[PDB]
Structure 1
């Protein structure tokens, strides 16, 4: 069968916790007062919930209310427990309250408001300095979560709220997040297509925090190369092929061979034989101002097939790409 894998950092953190920390099924939800909140505008309807802008009529604070839907009910307490576990951490969205919506009769999570600009428009305006600055801010959130025994599993531009006026960033939507336990097998049907790590695409279930570092790399590549998305697959199978056309097939085979993983046989007729490309292949007059040797080296160390070989969030924060960022 597959060779096992463990995280190379924060490996054992949950084992030292009281069971209550990670045993989210046993969590008793604490409820606030739904009458404190007035919905103002529906902002969207994800897979699992409807999201609204609202006002806390008690303090006049703008808030965001996510009225939970789901059919995998376990996700309710998992998200709540993860949010409570991470509350107060750097760049982690703050869960302000949990109320029972009287119409849906389901929990509604109340979050702090962040004044965001649509990433498709915003990313066209980020300078080189800004990309470095905000990447560093995302890393603070990821390293905090990972240090707390949690993987986000859905890192993507839509889940990074940026108030660019105030240079404020929050990592949101912890509904796919999980507790990391060594040796545990996880669902590979997580993350959005363009951000799924190779471990998901080859059906390797014993993954870890390093999944989030792939997704961060895929975001970074889109930002520095002005290519949205960077790896633009039509489906989850073609998604792997798009990755292999950049990173090469030999290193893909080495990865699956290391873990004694066999590709879905449907790859036989679509994967082909591709060399690893040099990153300069993607540089052109329109993105050159965002590219530097340090950016390319950092990216190269995030976008690795072998999840164990990727930079950790803390290693990433040590990288020369961030030396120019004021701290």
Structure 2
């Protein structure tokens, strides 16, 4: 069938990410036009309903193209109302979908390392999809865990061990950033610039001053979950199997 391989670039989404529409079928795809070898290699391993789908890649000279699932709903970031957040049932549904995606990644030994609402996209049915695997890495290979040491991520979402320890386990770092994303969804604000003792807001949290912002905006049930996720010691931090047993996580909301 002729021309079914031709795509028209119609608008810039985010190198650069463009919305491309198929000339014949009118199918919409996101095209990333450019570290890159690893991003493609990790994308080739991924297949999950809460992970932005990878269709393929092509290299036309010095320029590299990545064919990815187009998420028409845009970023979760744009669903968060500044200093308000969003309705608790929407935040719970997005958090369930985020946990499904992260469980999947950790199960195949991949850590995202940059979970934040700008990197969590929404499809036409508002289904959450983890995007941008540019900082992702393999932390488990041949059933052997590898401790990480590289400084990767975005400071307001990074776990405190990344700033304090030479080596650290990958999975609690992604759990922590999911807790900051949950905080942002329920309060429309980030709790601190970074999780350091020098940061007053971080010290206040460790001193359990939940009568302050953003915590005072969050109901006691999701706040009890945040108390288990945003634990400084990563060995004491709640694991995803235990997040799935949490009271607020399992609370029917409408």
- Equivalent position of 2:245 in the other structure: 318
- Equivalent position of 2:204 in the other structure: 246
The alpha-carbon deviation at position 280 of structure 1 amounts to: 3.7
- Equivalent position of 2:26 in the other structure: 60
Q: Larger helix proportion, structure 1 or 2?
A: 1
Which structure 2 residues correspond to residues 98-177 of structure 1 after superposition, within 5 A? Answer: 98-101=57-60, 105-124=62-81, 126-163=86-123, 166-177=125-136
Q: Are positions 1:292 and 2:219 aligned together?
A: yes
The alpha-carbon deviation at position 302 of structure 1 amounts to: 0.7
Q: 1:207 to 1:284 in 2, by over 3 A?
A: closer
Q: 1:317 to 1:35 in 2, by over 3 A?
A: same
Decide which of 175, 187, 193 is 1:232's aligned counterpart.
Answer: 193
Decide which of 231, 235, 238 is 1:304's aligned counterpart.
Answer: 231
Calculate the TM-score normalised by the size of structure 1: 0.67
Q: Contact between 1:298 and 1:316, CA under 8 Å: does it hold in 2?
A: yes
Whole-angstrom distance in 1 between the partners of 2:162 and 2:169: 8
Whole-angstrom distance in 2 between the partners of 1:58 and 1:99: 20
- Equivalent position of 1:3 in the other structure: none
Which structure 2 residues correspond to residues 7-26 of structure 1 after superposition, within 5 A? Answer: none
CA RMSD, aligned part only?
A: 2.7
Decide which of 80, 91, 96 is 2:40's aligned counterpart.
Answer: 80
Structure 1 moving runs of 4+ over 6 Å: none
> Residues 15-53 of structure 1: CA distance to partner in whole angstroms, max 9, x if unpaired?
xxxxxxxxxxxxxxxxxx995332222222xxxx21111
Q: Contact between 1:218 and 1:231, CA under 8 Å: does it hold in 2?
A: no
- Partner secondary structure for residue 129 of structure 1: helix
What stretches of structure 2 of length at least 5 have no aligned partner?
Answer: none
Calculate the TM-score normalised by the size of structure 2: 0.85
The alpha-carbon deviation at position 115 of structure 1 amounts to: 1.2
Decide which of 154, 169, 172 is 1:192's aligned counterpart.
Answer: 154
The answer to which of 197-206 and 302-311 deviates more is: 197-206
Whole-angstrom distance in 2 between the partners of 1:107 and 1:241: 41
Would you say how many aligned residue pairs link Structure 1 and Structure 2? 245
- Equivalent position of 1:281 in the other structure: 212
Q: Contact between 1:183 and 1:206, CA under 8 Å: does it hold in 2?
A: no
Looking at both structures, which has the greater relative contact order when contacts are Cα pairs under 8 Å and sequence separation is at least 6? 1
Whole-angstrom distance in 2 between the partners of 1:312 and 1:36: 45
